[PDB]
């Protein structure tokens, strides 16, 4: 295995190093506004060395943005695809590329058989080519790598089944900045090439000057280069026709033949296209070939890519004709005029890349190596697209909840083969497709119109219900004596209980377990653990009495804690935000211990008085002018006091101190150790009163953030043996710090209300001497080093925080893990900050046509890990990556893949069993079974189950941490007949494995395996 820590890769371009050296000056470069006046030697091309030009027609189709998926399908996309089928069928030399399989599958299934056959023929013959082949073209900033792989697999599995093709070239022309997670997944999924477009204009200029726009993009930790994927970065400001023929848009716009009047389009540079004729073709060709030869100067081979397309293009039959016939007249002239030394034709993306690599093999070019990412994007001036790292945060959090429910539903149901009447495959395909659709670069990004956001939300709610159905049918089957199991596939044997989604204060969605001597004395509950190691975690349920005790199924008592159910109210009469306790519902909390990829059953039983193994939390309400807070049968009376500082410690864990405003002020790791300053603070950013305004995409603050004025907030302290917490009602945020014996959990119930033109940020202030360095993750997969640059504006220093961020010095590290993607930064040494929500009244001129005024309450979740790192083996100061410690990684897993909780619905569960998975191997802590999916339906004689195995890399800090078992996924199901290593989409077999054993993977590697069972 390669060492991902100690060997700094030697690459030609390392983006952090490039950023440190670049000046980012925004000067007027002439017609290429953000470049320079390109010059070329006319003698470079001649009869023995011609410029080969591939004009690649395309149409950018968004699966929701200004209209919903279905509205665009009906108004635009079905017509584009119907006319592409007709025009390509009738014009053999015409070509077209297509990226979004969600739309193509919607179209293809509605075609009659004759047309399905014509479509398969134009694909098989190379006229219509799929590029990437994912369900969508995903956002690359906020998306989790597991969901980028899920959507890629959904689209490619459909293409293999119906079209018999698997794309090996990727096309990503619209995500707002680009992540190395894409080549990581694509290279492990059979790809050979990829193309990107939205990168900072200063980066395009710098790389163009060195002819480094084509490069072998490897991961930041890859010393050998085996992760490398050839990448083509487009050079100009847009993928539209005016910015794809060459450097001068006033000229290129004349070659977009849809802009002459009858289509309602024109050229803003004021020179319209003119129909090509025999009297003007020489002058028009002279202008176009000049643009092409200028573009060619920015690249190393004699093969040139010229995209020809824009948003929802190629819709009307007359548009297909006007573009095709005019370009055909230009090609016939150009190709017959030797003095141009050009051979131009319509082509596909794969044809371009195959010709580039033929040139490379002929020794005509060598390409530079590159590592790093392409965030944060700016398309012009100081307009940095860091706002969408936070926009519509409710849905960003929903993404992560659904991510986990899809994994858990696919894994729980994979253990058995199911009859078709159970509708398991149907519900899982619906859930995978709605979560996949939301990965779109106007979905999770929060950049769609309000009614489109509602459509994505409704689709995801249906997907969550589908996952719940599959999960509860699977738990009932896995834990019921076989000869007793009698399923009704439409019945709810269990209901899921989720404590953090939508969350307390967001929706009252949880069911109370109703017990009583005259109705039901006890209730079975079941926990699932999707991770491949034994895991303990506190779990809580609402119960109708405080006198409840817990047992495992062998009837062994389990220690439990009961606390009140507290809800916060914005009291419009007293004008204060304060908590109310329930006098008939209570929370019971206990530690569940669950096998690897397994289930564990417990029983909750009511008694007439305080049970021996259940304790009760104390509660203290700090505020001036308190009023009583009765709690029904709860056995401990609420105490009151004036605001004051307080300290809490649960178990042997850290001791946390809080200010009189209920905000953390210090963390003391052990009895002996020091009280380290760690202060939470809430601040607000505003919007500029003149100049450009922040909107869904852009973050354009009117200077550094200002502190939220807190007043004298109400603080609630709950102290228990198993769990303690401090909660405070601040303006727009109920902020909660929860302690269970390890790193605290932070929950913010964020309701920005009607505060227009405001972005609320949560900042941590420490005295850690981090300087200008901080680390943020990319897609939940890797941590990359960031350097704050005072030569760039504040918004350029904001990066996506898809799952975590940290700062450190020689001795101390503070890591904040997140349960949802948000934007953040470290704007000064010792600080971390992360945006909570943003409400903007203005549109930011990128096409959305509205501000962001549809905010709703969201419960954000986090874990805060302060650690000593002086003993850790860390990368050298020149390495571009960082790595988590064991405790930080486990804290991230506690947020993203918590235990699932099921409450048995009926009064009695006949045939109930206590555990499932006790014999499953408990794998080393850095290994995860990211995906477990049965790939065959019940009628297949040979069953197949696919697994994606991911190993992260954790720092070595001196903990012996030992005894774990080897995990061989190919032997998790019995009767194994074959084990194969496959691409990550499961679509191609790469290796037949000896002994039917699937090896574990190396740190930072991901592999897929498929086991076959007789
Ligand atoms: C397409 O798939 C392979 C090449 O990928 C080809 O040999 C096969 O005949 C085609 N279609 C079928 C029958 O799978
Ligand atoms: Zn788009």
Report how far ligand 1's centroid is from the alpha carbon of 108 (Å): 19
**Which residues are CB-neighbours of 66 under 8 A, at least 6 positions away?**
448, 449, 452, 847, 848, 849
766 token code pair: 């420490």
What token pair was written down for 638? Answer: 């609420």
User: Which of 948, 957, 991, 931 is closest to 865 using CA atoms?
Assistant: 957
Q: Which helix (H) or strand (E) is 419 found in, with range? A: none
Spacing, Cα 136 to ligand 2 middle (Å): 10
Q: For residue 703, count CB atoms less than 10 angstroms from its CB and return exposed for 0-12, middle for 13-18, buried for 19 or more.
A: exposed
Return the structure tokens found at 288.
């176009």
Collapsing DSSP to helix, strand or coil, 641 comes out as strand
Which ligand does the CA of 136 lie closest to?
A: 2
Centre of ligand 1 to C-alpha 163, Å, is: 10
What angle is formed at CA 819 by the lines to CA 852 and CA 789, rounded to 5 degrees?
A: 70
- Of 140, 135, 158, 152, which Cα lies nearest the Cα of 780? 140
Q: What is the enclosing helix (H) or strand (E) of 358?
A: helix 349-361
Question: CB 125: neighbour CB atoms within 10 A?
Answer: 10
| Residue 176 CB partners (closer than 8 Å, separation 6+) | 139, 141, 198, 377, 385, 388, 441, 445, 697
Residues in the chain: 1014
Bridge-based pairing state of the strands 1006-1013 and 943-951: antiparallel
* CA–CA separation, 929 and 917 (whole Å): 14
Q: Is 441 annotated as a binding residue?
A: yes
Residue entry with tokens 């897929």: 1008
Strand pairing partners for 657? 647, 666
Nearest ligand for residue 139 CA = 2
Preceding omega of 502 cis (within 30 degrees of 0): yes
What tokens were used for 375? 């965030």
Return the DSSP state at 832: E
Asked whether the beta carbons of 974 and 906 are under 8 A apart, the reply is: no
**Resolution as reported, in Å:** 1.3
Cα Rg of the chain (Å, integer): 30
What DSSP assignment string belongs to 840-899?
B-S--SSS--S-B-----EEEEEEEEEEE-TTS----TT-SEE---HHHHHHHHHHHSPP
- 774 strand-pairing partners: 786
Looking up tokens 């994912």, which residue turns up? 134
Cα–Cα nearest to 474, from 531, 405, 403, 534: 405
Selecting among 76, 139, 174, 222, the annotated active-site residue is 174
Locus of tokens 């960031």: 786
For strand 576-594 and strand 535-543, is the pairing parallel, antiparallel, or unpaired?
Answer: antiparallel
CA–CA separation, 761 and 553 (whole Å): 46
Spatial CB neighbours of 402, under 8 Å, sequence gap ≥ 6: 431, 434, 435, 438, 460, 463, 464, 467
The answer, yes or no, to whether the previous bond of 353 is cis (omega within 30 of 0) is: no
Distance CA 696, CA 842 (A): 9
- Answer yes or no: is 735 a known binding residue: no
Ligand that lies nearest to the alpha carbon of residue 99, given by its number in the listed order: 2
Classify residue 25 as exposed, middle or buried by CB count within 10 Å of its CB (0-12, 13-18, 19+).
Answer: exposed
Expressed in angstroms and rounded, the spacing between residue 730 Cα and the centre of ligand 2 is 38
Angle at 74 between CA 73 and CA 76, to 5 degrees: 65
Are 800 and 773 a contacting pair, CB within 8 Å? no
Answer whether 701's CB lies under 8 Å from 835's CB: no
Report angle CA 96, 98, 102 to the nearest 5 degrees. 155
How far, in Å, from the CA of 189 to the mean position of ligand 1? 19
Going by DSSP bridges, is the β-strand pair 560-571/576-594 parallel, antiparallel, or unpaired?
antiparallel
Neighbours of 286 (CB within 10 A): 14
Strands (E), 433-555: 494-496, 512-513, 522-529, 535-543, 548-552
Within 8 A by CB and 6+ apart from 380, the residues are 26, 34, 201, 237
164 CA distance to ligand 1 middle (Å): 7
SS3 assignment for 159-208? HHHHHCCCCCEEEECCCCCECCHHHHHHHCCCCCEEEECCCCHHHHHHHH
Helix (H, G, I), strand (E, B) or coil at 249: helix
The tokens for 560 are 């439990």
Nearest to 743 by CA among 658, 862, 619: 862
CA atoms within 13 A on the CB side of 683: 18
> For strand 900-904 and strand 494-496, is the pairing parallel, antiparallel, or unpaired?
antiparallel
Helices 450-478 and 424-438, axial angle in degrees (round to 10): 150
Q: How far is the CA of 794 from the centre of ligand 1 (A)?
A: 54
Q: 361 CA to middle of ligand 1, Å?
A: 28
Tell me how crowded residue 520 is: count the other CB atoms within 10 A of its CB.
14
If you measure from the C-alpha of residue 389 to the centroid of ligand 2, how many angstroms do you get, rounded to a whole number? Answer: 16
Instruction: Name residue, tokens 């934007």.
Output: 823
> Please, what is the Cα angle at 35 between 29 and 38, to 5 degrees?
90
Closest Cα partner for 199 from 171, 217, 177?
177
Residue 73, strand partner residues: none
Backbone angles phi, psi at 993, to 5 degrees: -95, 130
End-to-end CA distance of the chain, in Å? 33
If you measure from the C-alpha of residue 65 to the centroid of ligand 2, how many angstroms do you get, rounded to a whole number? 8
Ligand nearest to the CA of residue 198, numbered in listed order: 2
Please tell me the distance between residue 73's alpha carbon and the centre of ligand 2 in angstroms. 14
Cα–ligand 2 centroid distance for 175 (angstroms): 7
Distance between CA atoms of residues 127 and 306, nearest Å: 17
The two structure tokens encoding residue 886: 């064991």
User: Is residue 62 marked as binding?
Assistant: yes
- Domains present along the chain, CATH in parentheses: 1-381 (3.20.110.10), 382-492 (1.20.1270.50), 493-617+898-919 (2.60.40.1180), 618-897 (2.70.98.30), 920-1014 (2.60.40.1360)
Q: For residue 848, how far is its CA from the centre of ligand 2 (angstroms)?
A: 11
417 DSSP 8-state letter: -
Cis bond upstream, residue 154 (ω within 30)? no
Give the ligand whose atoms come closest to the C-alpha of residue 61.
2
Strand, helix or coil at 383?
coil
State the Cα torsion 296-302-303-304 to the nearest 10°. Answer: 10
Distance 122 CA to ligand 1 centre (A): 15
Cα(144)–Cα(398) distance, rounded to whole angstroms? 12
- Judge whether 174 counts as a catalytic residue: yes
Task: Give the burial class of 342: count Cβ atoms within 10 A of its Cβ; 0-12 exposed, 13-18 middle, 19 or more buried.
Answer: buried
Angle 946-951-957 (CA atoms, 0-180°, nearest 5)? 160
DSSP 948-993: EEEE------S----------GGGSSSSEEEEEEE-TTS-SEEEEP
Burial zone of 608 (CB within 10 Å; 0-12 exposed, 13-18 middle, 19+ buried): exposed
What is the distance in A from the centroid of ligand 2 to the CA of 264?
21
Q: Which ligand is nearest to the CA of 447?
A: 2
Ligand index nearest the alpha carbon of residue 66: 2
Technique used by the depositors: X-ray
- CA dist 229 and 219 (Å) reads 10
What is the C-alpha to C-alpha distance for residues 699 and 694, in angstroms, rounded to an integer?
Answer: 5
The C-alpha atoms of residue 100 and residue 109 are separated, in whole angstroms, by 15
What SS3 class is residue 409?
A: helix
Ligand lying nearest the CA atom of residue 172:
2
CA 61 – ligand 2 centroid, Å: 6
Structure tokens at 996: 């039917």
Region of residue 526 (phi > 0: left; psi between -120 and 50: alpha; otherwise: beta): beta
Assess contact for 717 and 726: CB atoms under 8 A.
Answer: yes
Nearest ligand, measured from the Cα of 197: 2
């Amino acid at each position: 295995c390669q060492d991902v820590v100690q060997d700094v890769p030697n690459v030609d371009v390392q983006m952090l190093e490039l950023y440190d050296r670049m000046s980012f000056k925004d000067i007027d470069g002439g017609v290429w506004k953000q470049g320079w006046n390109i010059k070329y030697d006319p003698l470079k091309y001649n009869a023995h060395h011609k410029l080969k030009v591939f004009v690649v027609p395309h149409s950018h189709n968004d699966p929701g943005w200004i209209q919903t998926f279905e509205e665009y399908y009906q108004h635009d996309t079905k017509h584009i695809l119907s006319n592409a089928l007709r025009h390509l069928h009738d014009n053999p030399e015409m070509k077209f590329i297509w990226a979004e399989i969600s739309y193509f599958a919607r179209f293809y299934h509605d075609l009659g058989e004759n047309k399905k056959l014509q479509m398969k023929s134009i694909v098989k013959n190379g006229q219509l080519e799929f590029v990437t082949g994912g369900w969508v073209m995903p956002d690359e900033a906020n998306s989790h790598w597991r969901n980028v792989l899920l959507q890629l697999t959904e689209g490619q599995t459909w293409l293999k089944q119906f079209m018999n093709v698997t794309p090996t070239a990727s096309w990503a022309i619209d995500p707002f900045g680009h992540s190395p997670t894409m080549p990581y997944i694509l290279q492990k999924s059979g790809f050979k090439n990829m193309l990107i477009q939205r990168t900072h204009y200063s980066v395009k200029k710098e790389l163009a000057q060195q002819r480094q726009l084509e490069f072998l993009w490897r991961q930041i930790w890859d010393n050998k280069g085996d992760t490398a994927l050839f990448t083509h970065m487009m050079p100009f400001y847009s993928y539209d026709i005016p910015h794809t023929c060459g450097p001068d848009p006033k000229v290129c716009c004349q070659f977009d033949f849809k802009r002459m009047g009858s289509f309602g389009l024109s050229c803003p540079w004021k020179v319209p296209p003119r129909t090509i004729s025999d009297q003007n073709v020489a002058a028009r060709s002279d202008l176009l070939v000049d643009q092409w030869k200028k573009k060619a100067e920015l690249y190393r081979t004699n093969v040139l890519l010229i995209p020809l397309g824009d948003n929802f293009r190629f819709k009307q039959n007359t548009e297909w004709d006007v573009q095709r016939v005019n370009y055909e007249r230009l090609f016939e002239h150009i190709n017959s005029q030797a003095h141009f030394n050009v051979q131009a034709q319509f082509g596909t993306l794969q044809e371009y890349f195959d010709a580039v690599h033929q040139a490379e093999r002929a020794g005509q070019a060598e390409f530079p190596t590159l590592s790093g990412d392409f965030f944060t994007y700016a398309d012009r001036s100081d307009n940095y697209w860091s706002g969408y790292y936070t926009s519509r945060p409710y849905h960003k959090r929903m993404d992560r909840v659904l991510m986990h429910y899809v994994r858990a539903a696919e894994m729980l149901s994979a253990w058995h083969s199911w009859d078709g009447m159970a509708r398991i495959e149907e519900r899982l395909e619906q859930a995978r497709r709605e979560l996949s659709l939301f990965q779109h670069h106007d979905g999770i990004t929060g950049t769609a119109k309000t009614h489109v956001v509602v459509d994505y939300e409704q689709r995801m709610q249906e997907a969550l219900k589908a996952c719940q159905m599959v999960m509860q049918q699977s738990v009932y089957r896995l834990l019921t004596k076989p000869s007793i199991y009698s399923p009704d596939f439409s019945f709810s044997y269990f209901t899921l209980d989720d404590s953090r989604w939508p969350g307390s204060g967001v929706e009252d969605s949880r069911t109370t377990i109703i017990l009583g001597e005259d109705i039901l004395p006890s209730k079975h509950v079941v926990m699932h653990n999707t991770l491949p190691h034994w895991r303990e975690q506190l779990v809580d349920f609402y119960v109708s009495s405080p006198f409840v005790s817990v047992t495992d199924l062998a009837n062994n008592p389990v220690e439990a804690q009961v606390s009140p159910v507290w809800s916060w109210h914005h009291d419009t009469l007293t004008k204060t935000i304060h908590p109310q306790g329930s006098t008939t519902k209570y929370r019971i909390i206990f530690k569940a211990r669950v096998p690897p990829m397994g289930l564990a059953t417990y029983v909750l039983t009511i008694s007439d008085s305080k049970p021996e193994h259940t304790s009760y939390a104390s509660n203290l309400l700090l505020r001036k002018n308190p009023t009583s807070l009765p709690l029904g049968q709860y056995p401990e009376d609420v105490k009151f006091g004036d605001p004051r500082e307080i300290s809490l410690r649960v178990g042997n864990g850290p001791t946390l101190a809080f200010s009189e405003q209920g905000l953390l002020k210090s963390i003391q790791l052990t009895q002996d150790s020091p009280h380290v300053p760690v202060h939470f603070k809430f601040l607000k950013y505003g919007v500029r009163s003149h100049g450009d305004r922040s909107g869904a995409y852009l973050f354009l603050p009117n200077g550094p953030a200002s502190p939220v004025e807190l007043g004298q907030p109400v603080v609630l302290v709950t102290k228990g043996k198993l769990e303690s917490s401090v909660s405070v009602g601040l303006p727009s945020v109920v902020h909660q710090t929860i302690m269970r014996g390890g790193a605290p959990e932070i929950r913010n119930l964020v309701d920005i209300g009607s505060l227009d033109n405001t972005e609320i940020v949560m900042r941590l202030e420490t005295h850690i001497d981090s300087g200008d360095i901080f680390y943020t993750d990319l897609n939940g997969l890797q941590f990359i080093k960031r350097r704050r640059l005072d030569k760039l504006p504040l918004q350029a220093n904001y990066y996506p925080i898809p799952s975590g961020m940290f700062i450190e010095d020689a001795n101390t590290r503070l890591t904040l893990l997140t349960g949802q993607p948000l934007g953040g930064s470290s704007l000064a040494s010792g600080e971390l900050e992360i945006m909570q929500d943003r409400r903007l009244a203005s549109d930011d001129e990128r096409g959305l046509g509205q501000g962001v005024l549809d905010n709703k309450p969201v419960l954000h979740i986090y874990r805060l890990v302060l650690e000593k790192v002086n003993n850790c083996v860390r990368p050298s100061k020149l390495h571009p990556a960082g790595y988590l410690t064991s405790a930080a990684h486990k804290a991230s897993q506690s947020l993203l893949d918590p235990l699932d909780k099921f409450i048995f619905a009926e009064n009695e569960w006949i045939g109930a069993q206590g555990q499932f998975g006790g014999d499953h191997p408990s794998a080393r802590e850095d290994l995860d079974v990211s995906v477990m999916r049965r790939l065959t339906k019940s009628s297949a004689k040979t069953q197949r189950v696919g697994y994606v195995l991911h190993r992260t890399n954790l720092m070595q800090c001196g903990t012996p941490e030992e005894h774990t078992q080897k995990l061989d996924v190919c032997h998790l199901l019995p009767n194994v007949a074959r084990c194969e290593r496959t691409t990550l989409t499961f679509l191609q077999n790469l290796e037949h494995l000896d002994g039917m054993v699937a090896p574990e993977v190396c740190p930072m590697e991901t592999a897929a395996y498929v086991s076959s069972h007789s």
